RNA sequence: CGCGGGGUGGAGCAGCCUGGUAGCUCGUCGGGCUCAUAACCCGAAGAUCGUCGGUUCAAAUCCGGCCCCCGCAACCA
RNA sequence: GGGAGACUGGAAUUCCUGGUGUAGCGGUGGAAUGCGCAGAUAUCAGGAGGAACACCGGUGGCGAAGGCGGGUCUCUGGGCAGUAACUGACGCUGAGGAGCGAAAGCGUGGGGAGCGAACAGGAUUAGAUACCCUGGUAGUCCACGCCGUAAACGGUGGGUACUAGGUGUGGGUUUCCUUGGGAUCCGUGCCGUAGCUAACGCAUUAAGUACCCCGCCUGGGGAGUACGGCCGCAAGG
């Protein structure tokens, strides 16, 4: 179809990836 | 210095210039002529007129060591192959062969990927 | 009349006093506007002063100066890809006569004699010997053409 | 070309890696292998010619 | 940077003077090539049970030749903002595009 | 302490050991290039040898100093 | 070019030693960092080492899908046709389940030529944390395992029967002229009726006409995210 749907989805995915970069450490230690 | 009865040319026509050595059968080079050494620099170095002046100066420095007959060996893709052969046949050396020895890899080392400009 | 092809040009009558295409064409390029009669008085008076300083036929002196300023190659202008390329091009006959007469008139007009007649006389004489600034502009135009020979290939 | 073959049409002929004449009928003046369109092979014998020329290059019988 | 501010059919509030000065002043920042600016402020749509269409025209003699630039908007500040965004991109292009 | 080399358009660099013929590179404006910008390209505007001294036709050039410049490597100065 | 193991081949790039030989080479839209003048680029001879396999080779073959092309040898998997010798419905699908599964990435040990994220400098630009240039580490390679994801796409689950044709090409049987056509079974493309579709299109390799089993959907965001559990060395799934 259009690539707009694909790109909205991918924006969400990207943002999430970044959010796991920055909290990586914090999730390990707060979880442990 | 010495005399050489006949030699072979080497023309490296790689886009930004042509480097024209001449060489005996042995392969030693009596003299080497290039567009850059003529006086052109930069993008003017790429031009076929730079190849004509490179083969002119290469044929004069060639003729100072007494070469008369030449077998021409031209390299791969670029501007200035038949122009350098032309300036050689006019500038004091005669035709001989025109051998297109392009160095062909056969999917060898992977080439640089793509220039997007 | 460009973009439709070549346009037909006006035929030019020759000179009454001297009998040349090139004298009348020098008059029409002397013509700072309005006064063709005064342009004829400048050209005629300047060529009889050339007759005084040569003692010969003035149109032979004129055509020898015209030959000694006449260019063979002109530079121009085509900018291939983000760089301005001075491209040398073969000059037509009419284009070469036009550059010869136009340079002759303009650089006579820069010269520092009192009237215009003495200016044009001294410029036709100095261009006949080869000592005017206009001959130096021919040598500078061939300097730009021979200095820029490589870019000429485009075949343009 | 636009023939149908010589091996599939003449219906008896063996392609032999020792035989340097038959393999040099199908390489070019450069030494490179000609196509199936240029020589008109059936596909089986185009595979066997290509492998046979390639073996003959491996044992120095063709100028690579 | 000489800045002429004409109406077209409109009052010219001290808010409009100051805002004009600061948007257009962005251009003084980074395009040193500027000379004269001429800025003229139309006002229609008004009177018709509808919302007034403003229009801004801006003229700019650079150091060299003459830009022009025209914008229509429901209000005046939003229009002059938009006009300065456009002008900034253009000029650096007329800055751009060159450099061999 | 010396023996040396070391000076030449604003500058850097030669040339200066075998006298007649001082170049060279950025600081130079004007062009052509583009509808343009700039570059790219062309040309142009400055030293006759830090300077002064003898001989030889001819002297930066050869020889005497100096202003200098130092390299240092020495100094139980 | 189905897979695995083993041995080996040449062209090319890079470095190395040695010749020949001089001031540029490289690079670009134009340049500059860069390598040079200590002997580079160029050319000739020899050596090392690694990776990828020009030509054949394409709308072509094989594999369940990923995927598979230098050669040879060794071990092994599937398919197709022909005869009909045998068995006699042993078929189909398949929730959960186990296995395989590009690239990137991960662990331990090797290897490291070319290419090359990150990382520098140069340039461009208002500014480039970018494109373009010069260099460049992990990686790319092999051995042994992890991981489980893709536009893993024919964007089309698997099986079966039927429904006008025309023309290419791949594998094999046969009747006729005597390689040429015919007919047939299996494959893969291009065009085309009927029928179907929202339309584009599909169209005997169906998205047509029907039957069997599975997966899955129920407005857009929030979100394939939280919480919880499972797997994983981690990234994460």
DSSP track, D5-31:
-STTTS------SS-HHHHHTTB-SSS
User: Among all residues of chain E, which has the CA nearest to that of C81?
Assistant: E100
In a domain, D40, yes or no: yes
Best CA proximity match to C22, nearest among C111, C90, C104, C116: C104
Cα B29 from Cα B80, distance rounded (Å):
20
Cα C64 from Cα C75, distance rounded (Å):
24
In this complex, the answer to whether residue D3 has its CB under 7 A from any atom of chain G, a nucleic strand, is no
- The CATH number assigned to the domain holding B74 equals 3.30.420.80
Contact of E50 with chain C, judged by CB distance below 8 Å, is answered with no
Cα C106 from Cα C110, distance rounded (Å):
6
Pick the CATH number of C21-148 from 1.10.455.10, 3.40.50.300, 1.20.1070.10, 1.10.357.10: 1.10.455.10
Q: Are E74 and E53 spatial neighbours (Cβ–Cβ below 8 Å)? A: yes
Cα D12 from Cα D36, distance rounded (Å):
19
Cα C47 from Cα C61, distance rounded (Å):
9
CB contact under 8 A, C83 and E100: yes
Cα distance between the two ends of chain E: 30
Cα E25 from Cα E34, distance rounded (Å):
11
DSSP H/E element including D33: none
Neighbours of chain D (3+ CB pairs under 8 A): none
**What resolution in Å is listed for this PDB structure?**
3.4
Q: Residue ranges per domain, chain E?
A: 1-99
Protein chain B, residues 23-62, with a C-beta closer than 7 Å to any atom of nucleic acid strand G: 23, 26-32, 34-37, 41-46
**Number of domains into which chain B is organized:** 1
User: Which nucleotides of strand G lie within 7 A of protein CB?
Assistant: 1, 9-13, 19-32, 40-45, 50-58, 60, 69-72, 113-116, 124-126, 131-133, 151, 155, 169-172, 179-180, 221-225, 235-236
Strands E53-62 and B32-34, by their bridges, are: unpaired
In this complex, the answer to whether residue E98 has its CB under 7 A from any atom of chain F, a nucleic strand, is yes
In this complex, the answer to whether residue B105 has its CB under 7 A from any atom of chain G, a nucleic strand, is yes
Cα C114 from Cα C137, distance rounded (Å):
23
Residue B88's domain spans which residues? Answer: 3-117
For residue C83, the chain E residues in CB contact (below 8 A) are 100
Cα E41 from Cα E57, distance rounded (Å):
7
Sheet holding B69-74, edge to edge: B32-34, B17-23, B6-14, B69-74, B98-100
Strands C73-76 and C87-90, by their bridges, are: antiparallel
**Number of domains into which chain D is organized:** 1
Phi, psi of B54 (to 5 degrees): -70, -40
- The CATH number assigned to the domain holding D30 equals 4.10.640.10
């Amino acid at each position: 179809g259009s690539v707009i749907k694909k790109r909205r989805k991918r924006m969400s995915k990207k943002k999430h990836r970044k959010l796991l970069r920055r909290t990586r450490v914090q999730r390990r230690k707060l979880g442990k | 210095k010495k005399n050489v009865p006949h030699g072979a040319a080497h023309i490296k026509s790689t886009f930004n210039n042509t480097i024209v050595s001449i060489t005996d059968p042995q392969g030693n080079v009596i003299a080497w002529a290039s567009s850059g050494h003529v006086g052109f620099k930069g993008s003017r170095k790429s031009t076929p007129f730079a190849a004509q002046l490179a083969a002119e100066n290469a044929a004069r420095k060639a003729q100072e060591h007494g070469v008369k007959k030449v077998d021409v060996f031209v390299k791969g893709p670029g501007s200035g192959r038949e122009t350098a052969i032309r300036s050689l046949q006019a500038a004091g050396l005669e035709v001989g062969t025109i051998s297109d020895v392009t160095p062909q890899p056969h999917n060898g080392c992977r080439p640089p990927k793509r220039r997007r400009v | 009349m460009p973009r439709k092809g070549p346009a037909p040009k006006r035929p030019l009558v020759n000179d009454p006093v001297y009998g040349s295409q090139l004298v009348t064409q020098l008059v029409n390029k002397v013509l700072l506007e309005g006064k063709k009669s005064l342009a004829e008085r400048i050209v005629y008076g300047a060529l009889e002063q050339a007759r005084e300083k040569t003692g010969t036929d003035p149109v032979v002196t004129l055509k020898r100066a015209l030959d000694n300023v006449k260019p063979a190659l002109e530079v121009r202008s085509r900018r291939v890809g983000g760089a301005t390329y001075q491209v040398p091009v073969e000059v037509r006959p009419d284009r070469s006569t036009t550059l010869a007469l136009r340079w002759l008139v303009n650089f006579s007009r820069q010269r520092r004699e009192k009237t215009m007649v003495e200016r044009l006389a001294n410029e036709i004489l100095d261009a006949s010997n080869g000592l005017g600034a206009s001959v130096k502009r021919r040598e500078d135009t061939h300097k730009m053409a021979e200095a820029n020979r490589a870019f000429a290939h485009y075949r343009w | 070309k636009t023939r149908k073959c010589v091996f599939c049409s003449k219906k008896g002929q063996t392609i032999d890696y020792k035989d340097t004449a038959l393999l040099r009928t199908y390489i070019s003046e450069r030494g490179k292998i000609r196509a199936r369109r240029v020589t008109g092979n059936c596909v089986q014998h185009q595979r066997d010619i290509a492998v046979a020329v390639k073996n003959a290059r491996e044992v120095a019988l063709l100028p690579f | 940077a000489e800045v002429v501010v004409k109406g077209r059919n409109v009052e010219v509030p001290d808010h409009f003077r100051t805002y004009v000065s600061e948007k257009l002043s962005r251009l003084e920042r980074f395009d040193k090539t500027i000379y004269l600016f001429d800025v003229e402020l139309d006002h229609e749509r008004n009177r018709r049970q509808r919302k007034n269409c403003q229009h801004v025209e801006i003229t700019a003699r650079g150091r060299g030749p003459v830009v022009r630039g025209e914008a229509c908007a429901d209000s005046f500040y939003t229009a002059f903002e938009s006009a300065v965004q456009k002008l900034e991109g253009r000029l650096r292009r007329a800055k751009d595009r060159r450099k061999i």
